[PDB]
Structure formats: C-alpha cells, structure tokens
Ligand binder design. Structure first.
Ligand code: HEC
Ligand code: HEC
Ligand code: HEC
Ligand code: HEC
Ligand code: HEC
Ligand code: HEC
Ligand SMILES: CCCCCCCCCCCCO[C@@H]1O[C@H](CO)[C@@H](O[C@H]2O[C@H](CO)[C@@H](O)[C@H](O)[C@H]2O)[C@H](O)[C@H]1O
Lengths: 145, 50, 145, 49
C-alpha cells in the first residue's frame, strides 16, 4: 500500500501525458492563436472536419510525432510572440511531406492499382481544396484582426 | 493471442489420396472423404416436394 | 526509492494494457480463428482494409469499449469452443447498432445536409457491400475449412 | 483523450421565411439555391437513352 501509491501516481502521470498529447493535436488548441483561425474555419467546413489537425499535420508514428510536435510548437510560439509573420502563411517543405504521407496512410485503398503518386508530386495537386479551401472567395475564409 | 495477417489469395485446401489415376467407384472415396460422402448420400431422399 | 519503482510498474502496466487493447482490435488477432477469415479476406480486399475491425465493431468511447470487447470476446470464445455455430453467421442487434454509429462517427460530413438516417434504418442498407462484400460470388470470399 | 468529432450528425430541421400557402417555385430559390439549381436541370430536353 506504499508501492501501490506509485502505481497510481504512475497511471495518472501517463494518462495525463496521453490526454495532453491528444488535446494538443486538436482544432480548439491549434486555433487558440487568432493567426490559425482561417485554417481552423476551413477545416471545420470541410470533409475532414472530424479528424484532428495533426491527423494530417504531424507523423502518426509515436517516436517521430513527439519530437515533431515540440519543434513545430516551438517555432510557432516563437513566430507568434517574437517573430513577424508575413502576409502569406505558407507551409514549408517538411509539412508538405508529412501532410502528403498522411493522405496515403488513410486513402491507400482508393489508390492501390493506380500510379497516382507519380504524375503529380502531391495528392493535393489534384485535390486542391483539401488545402484549406484555397480557391474560394476570401470572404468565405477570412475576417480582419 | 494470434499473429500473422490473413492471406487474400483464398488458397483452396489441397489433397493427395490413396486412389489410383482411374478410380471411378463411389465407395472408394468414402474412407478419405466421409463428410462429403454422407452429404452425397442425402440425394437418396425421394419423398419431399416443393 | 520504492516510489520510483512503483511508478515504473504503473507506466508499464498501462503501456501493456494500452498496447494489448489495440492489438486485440485488429485483423491478425480477429482472424486467428479460422471461422473469422471470410470477414478477414473481405476486410483486406475493401476500402476499409487499413482501419481495424473494432473501428467498426466496438464503441470508440473507452468506458463503453472495454466492457464490450470483454463480453464480445467471452461469447465468441465460448461459441468457438463449447458452442455449435450454424451455417449462417450473422450479427446481432447490438452489433448492428454499434457498427452503424461508427459509420456516422467517421462520415458525418458527407451526410450533414441530408436526412440519410431517416429512410433506411442503417447506412449499409444503401452501402450494402461495406457489409463484407456479401453480394459477390461465394468463391471470391470463401473456401472449405 | 478526446474525439475531434466536433460536428455531430443530426437530421436537418428547417424554418423558412415562407407563408403556409406559398406555391411559387421562385419563392423557394433564395432559401434553397442548391436543390433549386438541381431542379433547373429538368430543362434539359436534348438527351435520349
Ligand atoms: C486544424 C484546424 C488545422 C490547422 C490549424 C492547420 N491545418 Fe492544414 N493543410 C493541409 C494541406 C494539404 C496544406 C498545404 C500543405 C502543402 O502545401 O502541401 C495545409 C496547410 C496548412 C497551413 C498553411 C498553408 C495554407 O495553405 O494556409 C496551416 C497554417 C495549417 N495547414 C494548419 C491539409 C490539412 C488536413 C488534411 C486533410 C487537415 C486535417 C488540416 N489541414 C487541418 C489543419
Ligand atoms: C496545432 C497542433 C497546430 C498546427 C497543426 C499548426 N499550427 Fe500554427 N503557426 C503559428 C504562426 C504565427 C505561423 C506562421 C509562421 C510564419 O509565418 O512563418 C504558423 C504556421 C503554421 C503552419 C505553416 C508553417 C509550416 O510549419 O509549414 C502550419 C502547417 C501550422 N502552423 C499548423 C502559430 C500557431 C500557434 C500559436 C502559438 C499555435 C498554438 C498553432 N500555430 C497551432 C498549430
Ligand atoms: C459503416 C459500416 C460505414 C459505412 C457505411 C461507410 N464507412 Fe467508411 N471509410 C473510412 C476511410 C478512411 C475511407 C477511405 C478509405 C480509402 O480511401 O482508402 C472510407 C471509405 C468509405 C466508403 C467508400 C469505399 C467503399 O467501400 O464504398 C464508403 C461508402 C464508406 N466508407 C461508408 C473510414 C471509416 C471509419 C473510421 C474508423 C469507419 C467507422 C467507417 N469508415 C465505416 C463506414
Ligand atoms: C491529405 C491532405 C489528404 C487528401 C488529399 C485526402 N485525404 Fe481524407 N478523408 C478521411 C475520411 C474519414 C473522409 C470521409 C469524411 C466523410 O465521409 O465525411 C475523407 C475524405 C476525403 C476526400 C473526399 C472529401 C473532400 O474533402 O474532397 C478526399 C478527396 C480526401 N479525403 C483526400 C480521412 C483522412 C485521414 C485520416 C486521419 C487523413 C490523414 C486524410 N483523410 C488526408 C487526406
Ligand atoms: C466497417 C467498415 C467494418 C469493418 C472495418 C469490419 N466490418 Fe465486420 N461488419 C460490418 C458491417 C456493416 C456488418 C453487417 C452488420 C449488420 O448490420 O448486419 C459486419 C458483420 C460482421 C460479421 C458477421 C456478419 C456478416 O454479415 O458477415 C463478422 C463475423 C464481422 N463483421 C467481423 C469482422 C472482422 C473480423 C473484421 C476485421 C477483419 C471486420 N468485421 C471489419 C462492417 C465492418
Ligand atoms: C475465436 C475465439 C474468435 C475470435 C478471436 C473472434 N471471433 Fe468473432 N466469432 C467467432 C465465432 C465462432 C462466431 C459465431 C458465433 C455465432 O454467433 O454464431 C463469431 C461471431 C462474430 C460476429 C457476429 C455476432 C456478433 O457478435 O454480432 C461478429 C460481428 C464478430 N464475430 C466480430 C469479431 C471481431 C471484431 C473480432 C476481433 C476483435 C472477432 N470477431 C474475433 C469467433 C471468434
Ligand atoms: C484515471 C482513469 C483512467 C481510466 C480511463 C477513463 C477516463 C478517460 C475515458 C474517456 C472516455 C471517452 O473515450 C474517448 O472517446 C472518444 C469517442 O467519443 C474516442 O475518440 C476516438 O474516436 C473518434 C471518432 O469516433 C475520433 O474522433 C478520435 O480521433 C478517436 O480517438 C477516444 O479515443 C476515447 O479515448
């Protein structure tokens, strides 16, 4: 009953860690910064509204995901406080690769007997609006502030 | 409790009998295939109408 | 130091229960009984090949899922050992209702503007072959034991 | 953890700005432009099977 105190503080420590990793994948957290609002609005309006942000945006492999979350998170907290973001927020080369590998993780079966990885670099070179509905008028995605 | 994935090839079960190349007697199949044979013997029912 | 040894039991006893719960959600575990491999073949051949069996067959909610998996596992083990399954294996009301709720969990957004839950009792009344390709010739699904 | 199933499937419920006796098709077009666009396809009168 004194080593069974560790086996509670231990299961509550891991269950807290686990909840926190999942919470921090999610649209409410991602959009707690007003800069992420337009991407949050287009997510919620789309076919993919019911999967989290990191279902596309971070690796699914656990050993790859934790470090990716920390580094991306660190860049973002920085650019939101001490940096000066441009007028254009565009994904870098690394997120393009992790987003695209996730398309395939979930939609292999539609594509199994076709060379759809070979003509266009990315899936979204054909499925353009899976990229946050980027072809729709500006007022359907964006307000000032 | 169980480990390897299903195969998708649906391989039919494979047999090697003690029967010669040209065996045609129905009773010769009974010893090795009693379930299929007993099912075959159900064709004897000659009373039922639809 | 008998707390740092009891907290290492709790984070290995939850990491084992967590891994063991996901393992027994999956196709190699389910199809370990040969009575289950027509459903296994048809799962692997389908658009849902890369989601687990229990992504459809059990509640996603963790308080609901644990009891369900145990009760379902108990009766399936009994039927495979001391029971006598018939020529037809069919799902009960219980599993028709959990499978159907899971269709809605992953496919809400397709269906949001339409009364698709109202005419047909189940999603699979229209999406019939999601029920293990049941309309295809027997030889594409089944072999002798 | 949590579900990101933040949007729940619900049978649609409507309350229009129309009177109980409205029968003009054009009166529905503002409320329901998607189904109205579909309905206009019936104007196609060129295609045989
Ligand atoms: C949850 C609300 C989010 C948040 C906060 C973001 N996303 Fe996405 N995203 C997807 C794709 C294909 C792209 C383009 C990548 C590429 O160039 O190949 C993006 C891009 C972004 C950006 C910046 C770029 C932009 O176009 O605005 C940002 C800020 C962003 N994401 C955040 C695809 C997806 C998804 C897969 C279907 C999902 C889910 C999300 N995004 C969700 C979110
Ligand atoms: C939740 C887990 C997420 C996800 C998936 C993303 N964000 Fe943000 N982010 C913030 C700022 C100020 C920028 C612009 C930086 C710049 O102009 O250089 C971004 C950028 C992105 C991108 C595009 C850049 C890239 O990495 O390719 C993407 C895909 C993205 N984010 C996804 C600010 C914040 C936050 C404030 C602290 C928070 C919280 C998030 N973002 C959350 C998320
Ligand atoms: C309940 C039994 C259902 C029903 C009726 C449908 N789904 Fe799903 N589904 C999921 C994903 C990621 C895909 C795309 C897979 C890919 O592109 O490779 C699908 C696909 C479909 C389809 C199209 C394919 C087909 O077999 O006809 C249809 C009609 C369909 N679904 C309906 C994800 C999920 C789930 C997430 C865990 C769940 C649960 C379901 N699907 C369940 C159902
Ligand atoms: C990477 C950016 C992609 C791309 C190009 C696509 N997906 Fe997904 N997707 C998933 C599920 C469950 C659905 C069905 C939702 C529903 O039925 O309501 C979809 C839907 C699509 C579509 C059709 C809808 C559309 O917006 O055009 C398309 C073209 C599509 N996807 C391509 C599941 C997932 C994922 C699992 C977590 C991931 C990752 C992705 N999708 C990512 C992508
Ligand atoms: C969702 C897309 C499913 C996945 C993934 C798997 N199954 Fe399935 N199963 C699904 C439906 C819609 C049904 C019919 C339910 C109904 O309303 O009648 C079933 C049924 C079964 C059955 C027996 C009944 C039958 O029709 O064959 C079994 C034994 C079964 N399911 C098991 C099973 C296994 C082992 C799976 C993984 C390989 C699996 N299912 C995946 C939908 C879905
Ligand atoms: C052997 C011990 C099994 C394992 C492991 C799994 N299943 Fe099974 N299941 C088994 C038998 C012998 C039967 C038929 C019993 C009968 O009722 O005739 C079944 C039945 C099902 C069903 C249909 C009945 C129902 O519960 O709705 C389903 C949907 C089903 N099985 C699914 C399923 C899943 C998801 C499994 C993995 C977790 C799984 N089964 C494993 C034997 C065995
Ligand atoms: C300290 C006590 C520890 C004991 C554990 C009990 C406390 C926590 C239990 C929370 C109960 C809800 O459990 C939670 O339900 C939702 C479904 O609604 C699941 O959510 C799952 O399915 C939905 C779709 O159906 C997906 O959007 C999501 O990505 C997926 O993870 C969570 O994976 C599960 O963890």
């Amino acid at each position: 009953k004194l080593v069974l105190g560790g086996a509670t503080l231990g299961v509550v420590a891991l269950a807290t860690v686990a909840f926190g990793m999942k919470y921090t994948d999610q649209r409410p957290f991602c959009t707690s910064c007003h800069i992420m609002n337009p991407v949050g609005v287009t997510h919620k309006l789309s076919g993919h509204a019911n999967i989290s942000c990191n279902d596309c945006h971070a690796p699914h492999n656990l050993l790859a995901k934790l470090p990716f979350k920390a580094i991306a998170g660190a860049r973002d907290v920085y650019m939101n406080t001490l940096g000066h973001p441009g007028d254009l927020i565009l994904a870098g080369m690394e997120t393009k690769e992790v987003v695209n590998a996730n398309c395939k993780a979930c939609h292999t079966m539609t594509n199994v007997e076709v060379a759809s990885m070979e003509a266009k670099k990315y899936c979204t070179d054909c499925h353009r609006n899976v990229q946050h509905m980027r072809m729709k008028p500006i007022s359907t995605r964006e307000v000032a502030d | 409790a169980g480990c390897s994935d299903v195969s998708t090839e649906l391989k039919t079960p494979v047999y090697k009998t003690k029967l010669t190349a040209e065996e045609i007697r129905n009773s010769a199949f009974k010893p090795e295939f009693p379930k299929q044979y007993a099912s075959y013997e159900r064709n004897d029912e000659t009373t039922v109408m639809t």
